[PDB]
Structure formats: structure tokens, C-alpha cells
Design a protein around this ligand. Sequence first.
Ligand SMILES: CC(C)(C)NC[C@H](O)COc1cccc2[nH]c(C#N)c(I)c12
Length: 291
Amino acid sequence: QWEAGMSLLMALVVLLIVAGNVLVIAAIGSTQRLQTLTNLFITSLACADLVVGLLVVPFGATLVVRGTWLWGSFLCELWTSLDVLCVTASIETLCVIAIDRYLAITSPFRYQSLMTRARAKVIICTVWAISALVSFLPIMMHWWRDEDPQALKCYQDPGCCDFVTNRAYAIASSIISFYIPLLIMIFVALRVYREAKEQIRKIDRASKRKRVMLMREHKALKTLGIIMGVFTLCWLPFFLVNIVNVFNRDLVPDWLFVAFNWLGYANSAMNPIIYCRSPDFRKAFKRLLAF
Ligand SMILES: CC(C)(C)NC[C@H](O)COc1cccc2[nH]c(C#N)c(I)c12
């Protein structure tokens, strides 16, 4: 009856994710004070991370608990596609926010004259467009399938929903969906840690007006660096191992490959918790929870 002592932690984590992200969307949707530009991208994340809790985690939970896929050969690929999509759409939006805070911290004038709200919404959709094209289609077109006699065995089996992929895909799909966006995100997230350091460096002047607006605008930039940071810690392991197999299979235990995968799942619930650093958010979550 070990199944009962697991469905609790699983229903618990689904709760944290959903409740938490539904909260973050409401906090921004209600409070006009939280309806900033960057907080639109943050909304996108709250959605990607929500879809995970609502669909990706539930199904993925029954596959670990029962040890067998019970929802057919279709929902297998469909659940896989939503999974890959949500992770692609995330790293891309985090990569946007980096370039955003960069262009908004080095060209304050050009930024305001070019970056509106209706344009940033286009940006958000363009990201979800590329994410689908890149992750969703190649799966639908079965470019991931392997010719291995063992692999061909798992495709004809509806009860088996293992993501057995060839090595050509394994490499390209991980580069495109993760590594390239990650490197870009990291590089730019370091260029914004230098300018945001030189701004608080060449601040022996200013005032309790200009140092207060550099105390709020360095302070959010930290919360973003934490989001980008934690996210990397939860998904970089998984993708390192993912590549290891491409070079040398049977070197990493399958139980572990699933471990690091759930590590990256937990990352969806970690966001709303980190937003409690901001006084605004922290006050907005109390309004809704009826305190
Ligand atoms: C295997 C499964 C149970 C569904 N979990 C997949 C991960 O959530 C996401 O893994 C990825 C995310 C984004 C792009 C990716 N490319 C490849 C490959 N090869 C993977 I694995 C991958």
C-alpha cells in the first residue's frame, strides 16, 4: 500500500504549484501597482508553470506511481509535448527578461520610446510560437524515434511512455530548447550584474530620491537573478545527465534520470515562494488569502 503514501506528496506538490501560480497571476491581475512591464513576463512564467502542475505533473505522477502509462499512446506523445513545451517557453522568457532588464538599464530613453505594453505582449506570444515550433512539432513529426529494435518495442506499447530518443535529436533538441537560450540568458544576466553594479558604484552622489529608486530597482533585479538562478539549478542537472547518455548509456541509473527530472518539476512551485521577497507581492497575497 506504498501507493497511498506517495499520492499525498504528489497531490501536495500539485497544490503548491497551482495555488502558488494562480496566486501570482491574480496578484498582478488585480493590483495595478504590480502591472509593470517585467511583471508581464513574470505572468507568462506563472502560466507555463501552471500548465505543468495542471497537466504535466498529474499524468507524470501516475506513470511513476503505477509504473505504467495508462492513458494511451496518444496522450503519451501529447503529455510529452506539453512537457517539453513548458520547459522551452520558460528558459526563453527568462532569456527575454535578461535582455529586457539590460536594454532597460542601458538605454532608459530608447527603451521607453520602443517598449510598450502591446508590444511586450507580442514578444510573449512570439516566444510561445517559437517554443511550440521547436519542441511540439518535432515530436508530432516523430523525429525523436530511434530505429533500435528495443526502442521500436516501446512505441508499439501503449502502456510504455518512455522518451526513448535517437542521439541526433537528443543533442539538437537539448541545445535548441535549453543550452542556447541558457547561455544567452547567463551571459546577459552577467552584463546586467556589471551595469547594475556600476550604477550603485557611481552613486556617491544621487540623493534619498535617486538612491531610493536605485534601492528598489536593484532590489527587484535580485529577485530576478534568484528566479534565473534557482531555475538553472533545477534543470541543469537533468540536461547534463541527458547528454551523458548520448555519450555513454548505462552510466547513469534510470531512477536518477527520473530524479533530476522531478527536480525540474519542483521548480514550478518555487517561483511564488520567491516573490514573497517583494513587499508589494507579499502584501497582495494576503489580500486574496483572506487575512
Ligand atoms: C522525459 C520526460 C518524462 C517527458 N521529461 C522530459 C523533461 O521534462 C524535459 O526534457 C526536455 C525538455 C526540453 C527539451 C528536451 N529535449 C530533450 C531530448 N532529447 C529532452 I529529454 C528535453
